Amino acid sequence: GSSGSSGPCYENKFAPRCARCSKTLTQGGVTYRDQPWHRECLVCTGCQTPLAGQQFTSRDEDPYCVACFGELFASGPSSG
Numbered sequence: 001g002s003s004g005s006s007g008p009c010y011e012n013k014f015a016p017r018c019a020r021c022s023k024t025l026t027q028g029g030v031t032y033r034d035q036p037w038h039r040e041c042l043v044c045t046g047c048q049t050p051l052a053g054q055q056f057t058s059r060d061e062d063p064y065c066v067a068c069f070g071e072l073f074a075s076g077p078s079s080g
């Protein structure tokens with residue numbers, strides 16, 4: 001397995017791309033954490049729900065919906 005004399009140079013940023021897939025965002029879209037995200041992609045990291053323009057919070061670098069935020073981290077008080 002040996003190869004060389006390869007590796008072109010092509011790169012042009014004309015529009016924002018999903019921070020997850022990094023494809024393209026021309027039909028508007030959304031932005032999570034000062035970064036472009038796919039309206040569809042942008043979903044809770046627990047229930048997998050679209051927070052597109054919804055009231056939620058981020059934790060440990062992950063978008064979590066109020067339902068999860070106050071369910072995972074805010075688990076039962078002094079519970080096993």
Ligand SMILES: [Zn+2]
Binds near residue numbers: 020037
């Ligand atoms: Zn995406």
Ligand SMILES: [Zn+2]
Binds near residue numbers: 066
């Ligand atoms: Zn959730």
